[PDB]
UniProtKB/Swiss-Prot annotation, chain A:
Keywords: Host-virus interaction, Inhibition of host innate immune response by virus, Viral immunoevasion. It comes from the Viruses. Disulfide bonds: none annotated. Counteracts the defense-associated sirtuin 2 (DSR2) defense system of the host. Inhibits the NADase activity of host DSR2 by competing with the tail tube protein that normally activates DSR2. Belongs to the DSR anti-defense 1 family. This is DSR anti-defense 1. The lineage of its organism: Viruses, Duplodnaviria, Heunggongvirae, Uroviricota, Caudoviricetes. The gene is yotI. GO terms for biological process: symbiont-mediated suppression of host innate immune response. The record marks 49 as: Interaction with host DSR2. Interacts with Bacillus subtilis DSR2 (via C-terminus) in a 2:4 ratio; this interaction leads to the absence of activation of the NADase defense activity of DSR2.
Length: 116, 629, 320
């Protein structure tokens, strides 16, 4: 947990951990992580409200979320050390009260925007 | 040390005890009557000295100092990235050994390090004043170091490349075995070591420690800025005009980074202090732009942007900067549009091209030059450096100072059509690091052309069938760019029978207005969730808040999801259940609507005040300051 | 940064370092080495300035204050700068009896200097011995200076600077001494009016005081073709209701801003002004509803583009 960072702009965490999770349809995804992109200046449509967009990458390739992604974390594995960081992951998820408390990497698109 | 020469072109006597030869020389230069006395040989020698001093920008003594025009002018093809001219120069036959030294430097600058090393060896053979010999030895050692580092990097790192043949690598390793750069100067003829002592520093591993340590004067808070800038210009001119390869090493790049960054930060600090005192600085030019592009990584540019208000930095010589950018675009096209990609040259040049196109946001670009830059960035920029999202970020940054013209819109439409055509394969997918994809380019096009309709994308949708689903769902995110008939053709390919289909359509943009059946779908989902009580809930709460639903029956689902109740009935919500982190998720539109609700605005104001007072969070503070929620 | 919120460790070693600096101040200015002084006075000054954040014992604080007031050269510490150092020193240690006595000795010495006509106190910070007296009376509501009042009783007419000096320190005197001073010193000029309002001799402005203010403003206006800011603050505060002040707008910007908020151009507003205003004046400005939005915009710009946290504190506390 020495590489864990708390990004407060979007109250999430950056941690190099993959996740094994079971969705609401019993589907199994392995070695999946999340990438958050904080885009407040993003060109927003009528029904778009969220400030940051999250992508899911399983086995090095992203996934298209065509269904409700209600999921529960079954296992969390750290890359630098194979130690299971699950319980800490659940603790942080409970504390944060935000979607996807832990993210593989956060991409800040505010400073690279022309309007910044 | 008999005299000290200012970086602004003036001399001051110090440590000189005998005759004031510098003052006498300046007096002689000022008046030709006193010059007429000198003998013929002395007259020619004075003329040569005057040429040298004017060329090197030494004007007069401190007392004579007046309107000093200190304009930088680096006469080097390598500095301006005139790669075609450098190649032409290398192709042509070299008349002398000085042209061979220039050729070797240009070959080093073009990534042709083997040819440059061989040319340096030839110059060393044929050059034994000995100044070119010493400089060639220095540059050959530098190029050997560069080759070694490049070999190490390529061994460590996307595809396996072997720019230097193992035979050549072994030959250079044997030739440079036990080679000492420290002893190079001491081994030179004593006449050389006397005449050319000033070149000693070129044999040292570090030569910018003095210049770097003099940068602390930019961090003071109590001209230093002009001194630092002129010192940097002096170093650049000396290293480039003299064709020294150490101008490409990490030490010099870091020195330029530090100097430019500290100069900009000092200018920003002066600006803020002046605003605080008077209650309402760094003027960048072509050379500053080139230095920032070449010696700055994208991370360094981002640090500059976040630290300072670079939008307040006026950019000068913008036509020259646009010429630089267009030349970079042409070089990118040559490197990639053709098959002339040099691995060694590309490694170094891609960073400068990326930084130049990133920094171009601050420069007004002519329509034709803007089109050239845009096409080069969109099409011929390698994907291993700019992925789809990064390329979109680069492109959108260019609209800050140049409203998207029709030609640039056509270029973006061409890119979109090519992206769609690439989707015929069921395995090709857009890879983005910023999370931005082709739909983002379409959104930008509609932003600057609201009623713009893409004819070729419309046709591509009008040719789609039930088979190539990839093209189908790709064109769904490009729905606004499609025509009415194309929109109708695409819409038939998705079903909204269940709520999840509605969510997917809304996310992809299939449906933008909630039809009554959509509201009833949301309602049945709410009923099922309520029944099963003993993720989208906040989404529907926001939609009702955002006036995206006029059902007026959602209130039946109040009392289980804090965000939903908070959004449906802000007045009746108990704000002890409010989580301030919610405000960190809403975008500008939702936060502004919350602030303007005229209800619950005081609750959010007090929560934000508590957050700012207890955590000093800049995000909460900026939320409160911008929308005053 | 909020250095007052940083916990200082090894405070005893810090106090010993400060006390040693104080001893060197006493020694160098009692056998001064100019060369050593040149380098060491900067460090002593910075140490005394930064000592505001460290709690000090009575003996160490007394030594430091004595060196700062008496044996710290005026060439590097004005009277106002010396007062600033002292008031900062009181931050972590409320002025005890010993330090109060030291300040009383300093004030008595100041009065003795004023006995000579040539003496004059120069301070760039705008603070003078009256500030030291105000601090003494602030850290103890009723403070009687036996020696200052004794000097007051032995006062004569031949002294012109001494009379006003002892007048500015009236709250530290005794009943008889203050009565003699008032019988001898009459509020007749603008500076005397300011000193009386400060020490508390006058609470409300009579027509004579407003006439003095108007005469000062007339002199300034005639010449045109600190004081103005104070008059503008008073007028905006409604402490002066003469209403003839608006005749004198166009010389200094703070007066124009205070007297007529609506007509003041805000491209000439100085954010730094908001730092001088106290709590009650800040609240009056916030509630004026005439400049409130303009000062809101100024504070927003200062919170964004400035590193000073005072602007954020003001905006968040008073919404000015």
């Amino acid at each position: 947990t020495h590489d864990l960072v708390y990004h407060s702009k979007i109250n999430t965490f950056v941690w190099d951990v993959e996740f094994d999770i079971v969705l609401s349809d019993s589907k199994e995804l392995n070695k999946c992580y999340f990438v958050k992109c904080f885009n407040p200046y993003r060109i927003n449509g009528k029904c778009d409200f969220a400030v940051s967009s999250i992508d899911i990458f399983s086995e090095g390739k992203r996934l298209l979320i065509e269904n409700e992604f209600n999921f529960k974390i079954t296992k969390a594995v750290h890359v630098a050390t194979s130690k299971d960081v699950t319980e800490i992951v659940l603790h942080l998820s409970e504390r944060i009260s935000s979607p996807f408390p832990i993210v593989k990497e956060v991409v800040y698109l505010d400073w690279s925007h022309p309007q910044f | 040390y008999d005299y000290h020469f200012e970086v602004n072109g003036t001399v001051v006597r110090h440590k000189n005890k005998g005759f004031g030869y510098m003052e006498r020389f300046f007096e002689l230069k000022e008046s030709c009557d006193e010059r007429s006395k000198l003998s013929k040989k002395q007259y020619e020698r004075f003329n040569a000295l005057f040429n040298f001093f004017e060329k090197n920008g030494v004007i007069c003594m401190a007392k004579d100092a007046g309107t000093l025009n200190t304009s930088i002018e680096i006469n080097s093809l390598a500095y301006h990235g005139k790669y075609d001219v450098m190649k032409k120069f290398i192709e042509e036959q070299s008349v002398s050994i000085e042209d061979d030294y220039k050729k070797a430097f240009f070959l080093a600058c073009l990534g042709r390090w083997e040819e440059s090393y061989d040319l340096y060896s030839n110059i060393i053979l044929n050059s034994i004043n000995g100044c070119v010999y010493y400089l060639s030895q220095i540059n050959r050692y530098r190029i050997y170091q560069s080759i070694t580092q490049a070999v190490t990097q390529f061994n460590g790192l996307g595809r396996h490349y072997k720019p230097f043949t193992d035979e050549f690598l072994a030959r250079i390793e044997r030739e440079m075995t036990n080679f000492n750069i420290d002893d190079l100067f001491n081994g030179m003829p004593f006449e050389f070591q006397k005449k050319y002592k000033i070149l000693e520093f070129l044999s040292d591993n570090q030569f910018l420690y003095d210049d770097t340590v003099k940068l602390f004067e930019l961090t003071n808070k109590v001209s230093s800025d002009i001194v630092v800038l002129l010192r940097l210009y002096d170093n650049l001119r000396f290293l480039y005009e003299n064709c020294l390869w150490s101008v490409s090493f990490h030490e010099f790049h870091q020195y330029i980074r530090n100097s430019m960054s500290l100069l900009i930060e000092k200018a920003e600090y002066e600006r803020t202090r002046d605003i605080d005192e008077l209650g309402f600085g760094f003027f960048m030019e072509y050379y500053d732009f080139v230095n920032i592009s070449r010696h700055f990584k994208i991370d360094d540019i981002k640090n500059l942007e976040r630290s300072c208000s670079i939008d307040k930095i006026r950019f000068g010589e913008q036509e020259k900067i646009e010429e630089y950018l267009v030349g970079i675009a042409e070089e990118i096209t040559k490197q990639f549009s053709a098959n002339g990609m040099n691995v060694v040259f590309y490694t170094q040049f891609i960073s400068e091209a990326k930084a130049a196109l990133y920094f171009a946001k601050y420069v007004k670009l002519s329509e034709e030059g803007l089109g050239k830059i845009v096409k080069a960035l969109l099409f011929y920029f390698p994907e291993r450096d700019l992925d789809i999202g990064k390329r979109y970020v680069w492109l959108e940054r260019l609209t800050k100072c140049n409203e998207l013209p029709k030609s640039i819109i056509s270029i973006i439409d061409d890119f979109l059509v090519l992206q769609a055509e690439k989707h015929i394969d069921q395995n090709y997918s857009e890879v983005s690091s910023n999370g931005l994809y082709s739909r983002d380019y379409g959104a930008l096009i509609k932003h600057f052309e609201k009623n713009f309709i893409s004819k070729r994308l419309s046709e591509i949708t009008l040719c789609l069938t039930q088979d190539k689903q990839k093209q189908i769902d790709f064109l769904f995110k490009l729905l606004p760019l499609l025509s009415t008939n194309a929109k109708s053709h695409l819409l038939s390919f998705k079903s909204v029978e269940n709520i999840n289909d509605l969510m997917n359509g809304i996310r992809i943009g299939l449906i933008d207005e909630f039809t009554p059946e959509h509201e009833e779908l949301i309602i049945e989902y709410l009923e099922t969730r309520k029944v099963n009580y003993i993720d989208y809930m906040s989404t529907f709460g926001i939609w009702y808040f955002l006036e995206e639903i006029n059902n007026s029956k959602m209130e039946e689902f109040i009392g289980m999801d804090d965000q939903y109740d908070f959004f449906v009935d802000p007045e009746n919500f108990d704000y002890k259940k409010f989580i301030p982190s919610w405000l960190k998720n809403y975008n500008d539109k939702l936060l502004g609507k919350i602030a303007g609700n005229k209800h619950m605005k005081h609750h959010v104001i007090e929560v934000l005040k508590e957050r700012v007072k207890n955590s000093n969070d800049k995000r909460y503070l900026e939320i409160l300051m911008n929308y005053f929620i």
